């Protein structure tokens, strides 16, 4: 009858690291291996209230008394130095391969059918579209999240690392390569064939992705943000904590992985908003909206269940989405 | 009864095996009859020579440790006992369960008389403490403080103040000295008004049931527990007559054949463990006797509390 396996855990292909951000100057990007790290430091902020009032707090004497006792905070802040305008964000990406094989699966007949379905996909169309879009999200520095939104010039250098050194070095202009069109190129196709052979298992692919962003001297850079402890007084609050591995600001690894996954231009809603990150019930956190809702038949789960259990193979776009979720990994399964 | 002219403080007395069984229904801290009888024995032994009248005791209990144990799989407690000597034939004696508890109380004694003038205050304070060191407080020995950091001395506070600010000042000076404990008072007006409330709730209520109602922790439906004003312990507040008063050489096997004996029975009232700065006058909170022997009703309480 082939019901769904009760547990299905897929390991994560495309493992990035914590993206260490350091600083320096443009035209000395080629000597950027002794560049001093962007350090997370503290500063004390004070604001009046700016939030909406709920018609109980709109008394003018109460509003004046509320702005007379303001909230005093400390925030973790990371800036470039006042003699450095280029932010170097460096991580390493390891494309693993063996995407359809689960890390845990009860129903062995389901595992055989799922491996047969993914192998049917790879033989019909290998990881060529997916690797083209992953190579784009490396090529345009989408992993620079807010460090990219006002940068004068972004340049991404991607180095394929063999036995100990660079086997093949790419160098991209991340502002000519946009954040929304997965166009064709000559070097992006070479990087895409590399990531394609990595996802197929045909080779060890360890990339070193280094991105340089002309922001400006002293400007704020944006490492990934932690969550807070909140035990003491509201003056020493520590309202914002920033990530740092060892006295050096850093973006979390899964933030880089989410920006790499932003390949999904196939959702049923409009293409004017661009690609979203490949998630089951494909959801963007900022917009608060789950595209690929299960009411439409286009989430990861009804597509995977129609493809594997009852052989309703979707369109080539939706099965690109399904195999992108299998590359993404997860805990898919009931209780 | 009569107001104390001075207020003597016996400091933290360590009692090693005091009677934990206060009464047939209550265990824990010993009865206030123990402390009032101790202060009458102090009067009887040293107060008739200093020409003073030690009357009224305030009980503080800085430290309390009962020699109890909680058995395995049981919610309640049992008493750790002592191994008595054998019989004349070599068998183990029948065990009579007595509760022992290690106390650390400090007593505020009401002192009034003409001996306050004839003697220094520290002299009569030292004399009642050196007499109390050879005594016992609820059946347990008063540990006499050898070779610690410093011995806790006395202070006989003359309650007659030249001004009300000086009187409040040295009430504060004494309250700070007997602070880590909890003064034990008698709240029988609270027991009677709780009985009245329980009688407006349900008729034919006894104040044994109202005392129990102040003892329990009642769970209430909407769940919440019913809060209480204070600690509100059950104490044995004296005795009630069972027999008519027998003549001295008439009852059999009495303690002495010169005192009238009368079979009595406990009278369980309500207490309240409160801290000594909640009273704002330490010349209150002193436990006196009230006999009225023609009716029975031999009892102790702290009148002039509120």
């Amino acid at each position: 009858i082939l019901s769904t396996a009760s547990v299905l855990a897929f390991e994560r292909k495309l493992d990035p690291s914590d993206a260490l951000m350091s600083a320096g100057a443009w035209a000395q990007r080629d000597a950027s291996q002794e560049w001093p790290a962007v350090t997370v430091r503290e500063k004390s902020v004070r604001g009046t209230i700016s939030n909406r009032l709920k018609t109980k707090d709109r008394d003018p004497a109460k509003l004046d008394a509320s702005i007379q006792s303001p909230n005093l905070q400390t925030v973790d802040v990371a800036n470039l130095p006042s003699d450095a305008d280029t932010l170097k964000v460096r991580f390493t990406l390891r494309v693993l391969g063996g995407a359809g094989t689960p890390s845990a699966c009860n129903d062995a007949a389901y595992r055989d059918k799922l491996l047969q379905t993914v192998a049917t996909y790879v033989n019909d169309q290998g990881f060529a579209e997916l690797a083209r879009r992953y190579a784009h999200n490396l090529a345009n520095a989408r992993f620079l999240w807010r460090n990219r939104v006002g940068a004068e010039a972004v340049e991404v250098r991607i180095n394929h690392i063999r036995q100990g050194e660079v086997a093949r070095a790419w160098r991209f202009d991340a502002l000519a390569i946009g954040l929304r069109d997965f166009k064709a190129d000559a070097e992006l196709d070479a990087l895409a064939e590399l990531i394609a052979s990595g996802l197929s298992g045909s080779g060890h692919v360890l990339l070193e992705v280094v991105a340089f962003a002309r922001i400006g001297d002293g400007q704020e850079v944006f490492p990934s943000q932690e969550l807070i402890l909140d035990k003491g007084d509201k003056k020493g609050q520590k309202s914002k904590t920033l990530y740092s591995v060892r006295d050096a600001a850093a973006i979390h690894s899964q933030k880089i992985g989410n920006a790499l996954r932003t390949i999904d231009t196939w959702y049923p809603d409009e293409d004017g908003l661009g690609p979203i990150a490949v998630e089951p019930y494909g959801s963007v956190t900022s917009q608060g909206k789950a595209y690929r809702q299960p009411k439409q038949k286009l989430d990861f789960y009804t597509l995977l269940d129609n493809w594997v259990l009852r052989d309703e193979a979707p369109a080539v776009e939706q099965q690109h989405y399904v195999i992108a979720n299998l590359i993404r990994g997860g805990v898919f399964g009931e209780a | 009864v009569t107001d104390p002219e001075a207020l003597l403080l016996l400091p933290r007395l360590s009692i090693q095996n005091a009677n934990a069984i206060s009464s047939p229904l209550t265990w824990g801290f010993p009865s206030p009859g123990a402390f009032t009888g101790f202060v009458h024995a102090l009067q009887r032994r040293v107060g008739i020579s200093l020409d003073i009248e030690l009357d009224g005791v305030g009980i503080v209990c800085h430290r309390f440790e009962a020699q109890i144990s909680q058995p395995a799989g049981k919610r309640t407690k049992v008493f750790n006992l002592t191994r008595n000597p054998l019989n004349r034939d070599g068998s183990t004696a029948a065990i009579v369960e007595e509760g022992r508890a290690h106390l650390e109380v400090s007593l505020l004694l009401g002192v009034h008389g003409d001996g306050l003038d004839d003697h220094p205050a520290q002299e009569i304070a030292r004399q009642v403490q050196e007499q109390a060191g050879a005594m016992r407080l609820a059946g347990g020995s008063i540990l006499p403080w050898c070779n610690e950091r410093f011995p806790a001395p006395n202070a006989e506070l003359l309650m007659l103040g030249g001004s009300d600010e000086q009187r409040r000042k040295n009430q504060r000076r004494l309250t700070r000295r007997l602070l880590p404990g909890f003064a034990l008072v008698s709240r029988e007006a609270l027991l009677q008004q709780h009985l009245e409330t329980l009688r407006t709730t349900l008729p034919e209520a006894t104040t044994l049931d109202a005392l129990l109602d102040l003892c329990r922790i009642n769970f209430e439906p909407p769940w919440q527990v019913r809060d209480k004003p204070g600690w509100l312990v059950p104490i044995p507040a004296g005795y009630n007559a069972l027999s008519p008063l027998y003549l001295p050489g008439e009852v059999r096997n009495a303690r002495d054949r010169e005192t009238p004996l009368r079979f009595v029975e406990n009278l369980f009232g309500l207490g309240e463990w409160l801290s000594p700065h909640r009273v704002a006058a330490l010349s209150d909170l002193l436990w006196y006797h009230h006999a009225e022997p023609d009716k029975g009703l031999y009892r102790w309480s702290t009148p002039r509390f509120v």
Binding site: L229, K231 | A72, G73, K74, R75, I217, F219, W223, V225, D227, K228, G230, W231
Partner: protein
Amino acid sequence: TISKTDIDCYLQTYVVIDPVSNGWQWGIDENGVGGALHHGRVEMVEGENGYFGLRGATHPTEKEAMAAALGYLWKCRQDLVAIARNDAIEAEKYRAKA
């Protein structure tokens, strides 16, 4: 033949369901009086980062916080379960008597 809910009858006095603004967070009262103000030795616990509150997840309803409390007591703390077992046995013997 003493059932589980009759043991829960005397085990429920060992839990305390504190109200928070989100929901109801259960806890454990070591003195067995439901977290009374004076006679209640409630068990407070040390967590990850300065957590000093009741051991218990903030549940939406009291019916589920009490159920998670009883499940924790049945899984981990079997001495309070033996207390409630002997209480239930004495209650059954009491109804056999009076």
